[PDB]
Structures are given as C-alpha cells and as structure tokens.
TrEMBL record, chain B:
It comes from Scylla serrata reovirus SZ-2007. This is VP3. The chain holds residues 805 to 854 of 854 of the full protein.
Length: 51, 50
C-alpha cells in the first residue's frame, strides 16, 4: 500500500477537475428557438349521433 | 272606359299606416358567434396520437 494504489482515484479526480474548469472558460451564447408550432393533434373516430 | 257596365270590386283591404318615421324599425334574433360559436368538429375518442 503506497502512493501507487491512489493512481486510479487520482485520475478520477483529475478528470472531474478538467471537466469542471473547462466548463468555466467555455464561451456560452444564446441560441434562437425556431421550432414553435401547434402540430400535435390527436385522431380517432367520431361519435356520430343516430336517430 | 276600359271597364264593362258590370264592375268587379273588392270589399276589404289591409295596409299599415305609420305616423312616425321611427316606427319602421323592428328586431330579429341572431346567435352571438363571438361568445357562442358554431361547433366545427364532432366529438371523437382519442386514438392515433401523432
């Protein structure tokens, strides 16, 4: 049990830190939403009256 | 002159006489589409959502 047994955990922590500090410097820009539309209807059979 | 010695006549007649010009207005009934519109589709069961 030496400093070599901590290598995998060291890599786990290093990957977490790399992701975290690459998220900080990444530039973020808003995007335009162009998908709004009322196209989600439902079908079926009409309940026609009889008489 | 264009009538014979025997005359054909009418015993009764009916007509409406109005003394005021504002008596010519009457009323009728209509559905209010804005608040009670006419239905355009029948009631159906839910199937084939897409």
């Amino acid at each position: 049990m030496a400093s070599t047994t901590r290598l995998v955990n060291d890599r786990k922590q290093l990957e977490q830190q790399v992701k975290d500090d690459a998220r900080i410097l990444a530039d973020a820009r808003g995007l335009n939403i162009t998908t709004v539309a009322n196209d989600s209807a439902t079908g079926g059979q009409a309940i026609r009256n009889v008489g | 002159a264009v009538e014979m010695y025997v005359a054909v006549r009418i015993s009764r007649f009916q007509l409406e006489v109005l003394r005021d010009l504002h008596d010519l207005v009457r009323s009728r009934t209509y559905l209010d589409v804005s608040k009670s519109p006419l239905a355009t589709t029948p009631i159906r069961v839910v199937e084939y959502v897409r």
